[PDB]
C-alpha cells in the first residue's frame, strides 16, 4: 500500500513518522533510549560520549553507534 | 474558516458529478450522519463508513449514481409546518420527488415525515 509515501497527516488514520531507538556506543555497552528527531545534544550518563546531533530532521548519530528501532 | 455540512454535501456533488464511486468527508458530525441516513433511507446513496483515527472524525460514502444535486441552506431559516410548501416549491424540481431536510426537536428528518408528524424546525439542506 502507498500510504507510507503520503504526508503524516493525510493518511486515512494519521500516524507519526518518528521513532524511539535503543542506541549503543562503543566504550560503554549500555543502551540509551533516544528520539529520532532529537533537538538536543545528548550524552550517555556513563561514558560521557556525545551521542547524537540535532539537525532539521532526524538526529545524526555519531561514529559507530548502533541503534535499533523499538 | 469552516462550517461543515457544506463541505460534505458539496464534496459529494462534485464526486457524483465526476462519476466517482467513493467520496471522503474529512470533518464529520452527528448532523452529517443524520443527514446521510435520510439520503440512504430515501435511496440516493449506498452504505457509508465512519473512520475514527481519533479527532473530529472521517467518513467514506458509496455513491449509487442516482443523486443529482444535494446542497445546504446555510443561514438555516426558521421553518414552520405551514411554509414547508413554499420552500419546496422554491427549492425542489417538482411536487413528485426531492426532499428538504429539516432539523426538528423530534430529530433530523425530511419534510414529508415532518408533515405527517406535524412539526416544524429549521432547514438544513435538500437533495434530489
Amino acid at each position: 500500500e502507498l500510504e507510507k509515501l503520503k504526508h503524516k497527516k493525510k493518511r486515512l488514520v494519521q500516524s507519526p513518522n518518528s521513532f524511539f531507538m535503543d542506541v549503543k556506543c562503543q566504550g560503554c555497552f549500555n543502551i540509551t533510549t533516544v528520539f529520532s528527531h532529537s533537538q538536543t545534544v545528548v550524552v550517555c550518563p556513563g561514558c560521557q560520549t556525545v551521542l547524537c546531533q540535532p539537525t532539521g530532521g532526524k538526529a545524526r548519530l555519531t561514529e559507530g553507534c548502533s541503534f535499533r528501532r523499538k | 474558516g469552516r462550517r461543515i455540512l457544506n463541505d460534505a454535501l458539496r464534496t459529494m456533488v462534485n464526486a457524483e458529478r465526476r462519476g466517482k464511486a467513493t467520496a471522503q468527508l474529512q470533518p464529520i458530525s452527528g448532523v452529517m450522519i443524520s443527514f446521510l441516513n435520510i439520503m440512504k433511507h430515501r435511496g440516493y446513496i449506498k452504505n457509508f463508513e465512519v473512520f475514527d483515527p481519533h479527532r473530529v472524525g472521517k467518513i467514506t460514502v458509496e455513491l449509487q449514481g442516482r443523486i443529482k444535486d444535494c446542497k445546504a441552506l446555510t443561514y438555516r431559516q426558521d421553518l414552520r409546518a405551514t411554509e414547508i410548501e413554499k420552500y419546496r416549491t422554491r427549492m425542489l424540481p417538482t411536487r413528485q420527488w426531492g426532499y428538504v431536510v429539516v432539523t426538528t426537536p423530534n430529530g433530523v428528518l425530511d419534510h414529508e415525515e415532518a408533515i405527517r408528524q406535524n412539526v416544524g424546525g429549521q432547514v438544513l439542506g435538500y437533495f434530489h
Partner: protein, 214 residues
C-alpha cells in the same frame, strides 16, 4: 427519388422502422431528412424569422438571409433548423430540412396528479444559448403557456399545454432565444428521475439486428 446513402436510410426505405424512438434509444445520427418524413407522418413546419446578415467587401455589402424554422408534431417531437442562403426561399428550404434532421423527443409530465394525458414538463428545466437563459416550470392543468411568442410557438409544436416560463438575457436576439428554448426542451429527457432508476435491459442496435440484410 431517394436512393438513400446511409444504413439507417436503407432500413427505413425497406420499412423496418415505424417510429423514431428506435433511433432515439440508440442515439443514432440521422443524416437524411426522408427518414423523418416517413417515420413522422404529420410533421408541421413554420418560419419564425427571416434575418438579413451582411458581410463587408470592397465592392459593397453582400447580403444573405438566415431563416429560423421550427418543426414538430404537437405530440412530443420538435426540431429547429437555421439556414443562411443568398435567397429567402432556398434559405427556408434548407431550414426545413435541417429542422427535420434535428427532431428531438420531449418528455411530458404531470404537475400534481397523474390523471389523463401528460400536459407539462416533468420538472424544472433550464436552457442557455449565448446570454439567453430560459426556465420552464411545471404548471397546473389548463393554465396555458406563460411565455413570449417565440418560446410559445416552440412549446406549441412540442405538445406541451401548461408551463410557467421565465427568461433572462438578450431575448431580443431571436436566434439565441429560440435555440435556448430548443435546448431547454431537448434536456427534459436527460434528468435522472426515480422512475428511471430501474436498470436498463439493452437491445441490439439497428446496425446489429439487421446485420444479414446489410
Amino acid at each position: 427519388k431517394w436512393v438513400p446513402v446511409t444504413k439507417l436510410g436503407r432500413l427505413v426505405k425497406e420499412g423496418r422502422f415505424t417510429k423514431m424512438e428506435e433511433i432515439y434509444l440508440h442515439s443514432l445520427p440521422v443524416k437524411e431528412h426522408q427518414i423523418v418524413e416517413t417515420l413522422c407522418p404529420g410533421l408541421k413546419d413554420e418560419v419564425m424569422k427571416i434575418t438579413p446578415v451582411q458581410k463587408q467587401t470592397r465592392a459593397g455589402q453582400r447580403t444573405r438571409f438566415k431563416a429560423f424554422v421550427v418543426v414538430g408534431d404537437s405530440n412530443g417531437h420538435v426540431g429547429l433548423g437555421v439556414k443562411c442562403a443568398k435567397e429567402v426561399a432556398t434559405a427556408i428550404r434548407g431550414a426545413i430540412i435541417l429542422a427535420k434532421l434535428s427532431i428531438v423527443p420531449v418528455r411530458r409530465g404531470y404537475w400534481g396528479n397523474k390523471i389523463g394525458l401528460p400536459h407539462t414538463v416533468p420538472c424544472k428545466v433550464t436552457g442557455k444559448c449565448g446570454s439567453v437563459t430560459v426556465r420552464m416550470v411545471p404548471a397546473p392543468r389548463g393554465s396555458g403557456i406563460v411565455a413570449a411568442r417565440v418560446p410559445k410557438k416552440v412549446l406549441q409544436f412540442a405538445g406541451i399545454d401548461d408551463v410557467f416560463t421565465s427568461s433572462r438575457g438578450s431575448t431580443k436576439t431571436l436566434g439565441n432565444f429560440v435555440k435556448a428554448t430548443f435546448d431547454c426542451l431537448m434536456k427534459t429527457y436527460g434528468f435522472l428521475t426515480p422512475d428511471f432508476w430501474r436498470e436498463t435491459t439493452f437491445t441490439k442496435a439497428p446496425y446489429q439486428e439487421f446485420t444479414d440484410i446489410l
